[PDB]
Amino acid sequence: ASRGCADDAGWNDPAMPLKVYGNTWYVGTCGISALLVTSDAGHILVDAATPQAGPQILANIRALGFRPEDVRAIVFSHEHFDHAGSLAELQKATGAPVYARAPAIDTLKRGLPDRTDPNFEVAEPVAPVANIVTLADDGVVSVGPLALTAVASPGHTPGGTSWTWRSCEGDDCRQMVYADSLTAISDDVFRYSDDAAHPGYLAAFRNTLARVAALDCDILVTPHPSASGLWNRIGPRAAAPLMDTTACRRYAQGARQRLEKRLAEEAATS
Ligand SMILES: [Ca+2]
Ligand SMILES: [Ca+2]
Ligand SMILES: [Mg+2]
Ligand SMILES: [Mg+2]
Ligand SMILES: [Zn+2]
Ligand SMILES: [Zn+2]
């Protein structure tokens, strides 16, 4: 029997791919999520993990019996190197457009962020993405019968987005939420409390927390699987229910607490 994945797993430690629910499959690593949402009209790939993960994700797609060439759209959570790292690599393999909100586009074209990213100084360089479709802040990405709805989620980054869709097993349908990271982390320079340096940025983060908390949410998945306890819900170590309609609300409330701790830390330092 396989032992499964650790919560502190390396971002590049391989995971055996497995069904999340219905036509939503996990194709990421033990430390970093990626999902494949499938149909007989083609598929949608959600996230790209770490600049080193293009081959694992592609291998995992094929392990499940799906073809990367049948992916017709790529979406992602946010424009940090540990989630957007293998986008260009995946675009070549699939031929699919990458959808991105306006505040992430320059980062995707450069392969590095600018000072609008809290984590600017710790960014690792990515391959640029050549074919980007600009995504409205409440846009829907459609591939045949599939429809993924964007929920703009700025705060952890300017361009972050959460995604929601329905997956079914027979007549039993679930609202899936791939909620963006909500951690108030940064490089050693950025201050969330310095509004003059980035007017409205922290207010937008608070608004994201409220919006995520309110989402209809049967099954939550997050870019770092441990942020939603994913390996306690699927795979060999599963001991808690996959479905929990309180998960989004609890995820956002914890994030709000941690955001306010970060503000306290900033108040304590010059
Ligand atoms: Ca329902
Ligand atoms: Ca996360
Ligand atoms: Mg693998
Ligand atoms: Mg949580
Ligand atoms: Zn991040
Ligand atoms: Zn991350």
Domain ranges of the chain: 1-270
Where does 1-270 sit in CATH, by number?
Answer: 3.60.15.10
Distance 223 CA to ligand 2 centre (A): 4
Sequence ranges of the binding site: 51, 60, 78, 80, 82-83, 89, 156, 216, 218, 224, 232, 237
**Reported structure resolution in angstroms:** 1.4
Structure-determination approach = X-ray
Distance 169 CA to ligand 6 centre (A): 30
CA–CA–CA angle 58, 20, 142 (5° rounding): 70
| CB contact at 8 A, 182 and 208 | yes
Distance 224 CA to ligand 4 centre (A): 11
Distance 196 CA to ligand 3 centre (A): 44
